[PDB]
Structure 1
Amino acid sequence: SDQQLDCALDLMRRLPPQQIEKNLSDLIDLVPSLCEDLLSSVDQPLKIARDKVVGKDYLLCDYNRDGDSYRSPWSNKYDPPLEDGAMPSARLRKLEVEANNAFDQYRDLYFEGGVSSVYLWDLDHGFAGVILIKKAGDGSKKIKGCWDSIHVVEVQEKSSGRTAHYKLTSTVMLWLQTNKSGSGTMNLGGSLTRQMEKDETVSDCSPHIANIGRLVEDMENKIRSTLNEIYFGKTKDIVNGLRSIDAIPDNQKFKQLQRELSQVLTQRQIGIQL
């Protein structure tokens, strides 16, 4: 009962990224009983929708949905108008109004484009939040890639001291391709997920959303550098290990001497040992 969903997850990570949505369709063809629950487990590329009253696009998600009815972050509405409760926490309303503004100013300084969205929750002790960012490739530019990232934020209660523990989980999907004539076609893909927790004070000069912006920006910079240097870095090592650029008869001529050198040095180091 529990091994099959683990096997489905194992299949999911194995396939290449660039067509996974087709595989999601194929997934619901195989096993219908576990179709719903796997969507809560496997991250998926997100969909783009259009607001009709303000003329701008927003980002569909899973946790801003109730009975197959979504809410826009900017203009409170639903596809069925006024059939269910919409956008609680009026005291948090203003903390969305700045936030929907705030992170797009962060879009303008890093991505020079893209689409963002934020939706906060209510819970028993504090609140929670889900933050989405998407960037598509440029039509004019030869490079055609995609960046998606999802973030989940939780805050616990504190009786006194004005110190809040933010727990931030993040996940990133990345796709790149090049078609230069010198090297033909090359493709690169990536999926990563991380977490951390941090305590920090609450101040009038530094409200909560300043801290949330700090954590989001720090996580994105760290994950970008980590994926560029550590993960993508040693693919170059594998491909240069498949074949050396220069001919190498020379090292094989002295390789047995190198092995004997290692053996006698291993003898000698124990022989003296300082």
Structure 2
Amino acid sequence: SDQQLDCALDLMRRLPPQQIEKNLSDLIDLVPSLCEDLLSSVDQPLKIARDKVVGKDYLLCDYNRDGDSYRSPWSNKYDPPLEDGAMPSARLRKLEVEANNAFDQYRDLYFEGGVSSVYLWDLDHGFAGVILIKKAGDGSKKIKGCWDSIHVVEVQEKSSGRTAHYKLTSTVMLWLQTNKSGSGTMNLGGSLTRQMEKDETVSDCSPHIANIGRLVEDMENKIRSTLNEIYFGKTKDIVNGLRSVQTFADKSKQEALKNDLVEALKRKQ
């Protein structure tokens, strides 16, 4: 159980997540005793959601879901239609519409597609929510993937002195299904996981949503930078290190003379 849970963690840590559902099926058909909180630890992909009473696309996640009834922020309704419509602050619901609107604009600014959905609620002093951006590898390019931006906005909204607190949890899945002739059958990708906090004296001109877009974008940039740098160069490091295109019988003597230069440095120091 517990040791099996650790095995499943290392499993998922090393399993190819393009088979999350089939790998999860292997996990259930292998250990159904630990079928309790599978997706609590195991990271899930995103799910399409189209409203029908309104007719607008939204997303399917954890907090919008009520048992099996997902909340539609277009109609603020639980699907399958239930009278169990436990909905949060209506004012914040409209503010959420504005937030998701701005973020749909934002995804149309940096992504031009996909769906953004920050499903929030209303806790005691603060609350939390989830940032959801579903944008797979578009058919416009044979290079594909599955962009899933799942983030947790954790607003520890204080009261005295118009201040509040923020905490961002992050993860963005995406593949690199680049199978061009020059790329052969290149495929790479994954997701990261980071966090950050904030203690802002939140005014009215810069709301919580503004902070969200700001630091979230900043985080995304850090992620993108980390990917592009560390992981790409890392892979290339391993490539050129293992399979090199460098003829030896030269580097030894040249570095030997360089060491002689270091000797000369020591001759004066």
- Provide the rounded CA distance (Å) in 2 between the counterparts of 1:129 and 1:34: 27
Is the 1:115–1:134 contact (alpha carbons within 8 Å) kept by the matching residues of 2? yes
Question: Cα distance, 1:5 vs. partner?
Answer: 0.9
Q: Where does structure 2 lack aligned partners over 5 or more consecutive residues? A: none
1:262/1:30 CA distance change after superposition, 3 Å? farther
Provide the identity percentage.
Answer: 93
Partner-residue secondary structure (3-state), 1:193:
coil
Is the 2:137–2:144 contact (alpha carbons within 8 Å) kept by the matching residues of 1? yes
- Provide the rounded CA distance (Å) in 1 between the counterparts of 2:27 and 2:121: 30
- Provide the rounded CA distance (Å) in 2 between the counterparts of 1:236 and 1:93: 47
Alignment of 1:1-274 (within 5 A): 1-252=1-252
What's the TM-score once normalised by structure 1's chain length?
0.88
CA deviation profile, 1:54-86 (whole Å, cap 9, x unmatched): 333322112222222111122222234242133
1:265/1:165 CA distance change after superposition, 3 Å? same
Partner-residue secondary structure (3-state), 1:59:
strand
Question: Cα distance, 1:266 vs. partner?
Answer: 8.2
CA deviation profile, 1:4-54 (whole Å, cap 9, x unmatched): 211111100111233233211211111112113131112111221322233
- Provide the rounded CA distance (Å) in 2 between the counterparts of 1:210 and 1:184: 42
Q: Where does structure 1 lack aligned partners over 5 or more consecutive residues? A: 270-274
CA deviation profile, 1:69-119 (whole Å, cap 9, x unmatched): 111122222234242133221231221121121111101110011111121
1:187/1:267 CA distance change after superposition, 3 Å? farther
Higher-Rg member (1/2): 1
Partner-residue secondary structure (3-state), 2:71:
coil
Is the 2:125–2:158 contact (alpha carbons within 8 Å) kept by the matching residues of 1? no
Partner-residue secondary structure (3-state), 1:117:
strand
Is the 2:63–2:120 contact (alpha carbons within 8 Å) kept by the matching residues of 1? no
Structure 1 window deviating more from structure 2 (140-149 vs 5-14): it is 140-149
1:93/1:9 CA distance change after superposition, 3 Å? same
Q: Extract structure 1 runs of 4+ deviating beyond 4 A.
A: 252-269
Is the 1:49–1:58 contact (alpha carbons within 8 Å) kept by the matching residues of 2? yes
Question: Cα distance, 1:267 vs. partner?
Answer: 10
- Ranked by relative contact order (alpha carbons within 8 Å, sequence separation 6 or more), the top structure is 1
What's the TM-score once normalised by structure 2's chain length?
0.89
- Provide the rounded CA distance (Å) in 1 between the counterparts of 2:157 and 2:112: 36
1:93/1:182 CA distance change after superposition, 3 Å? closer
- Provide the rounded CA distance (Å) in 2 between the counterparts of 1:141 and 1:80: 36
- Provide the rounded CA distance (Å) in 2 between the counterparts of 1:27 and 1:262: 57
Question: Cα distance, 1:166 vs. partner?
Answer: 0.6
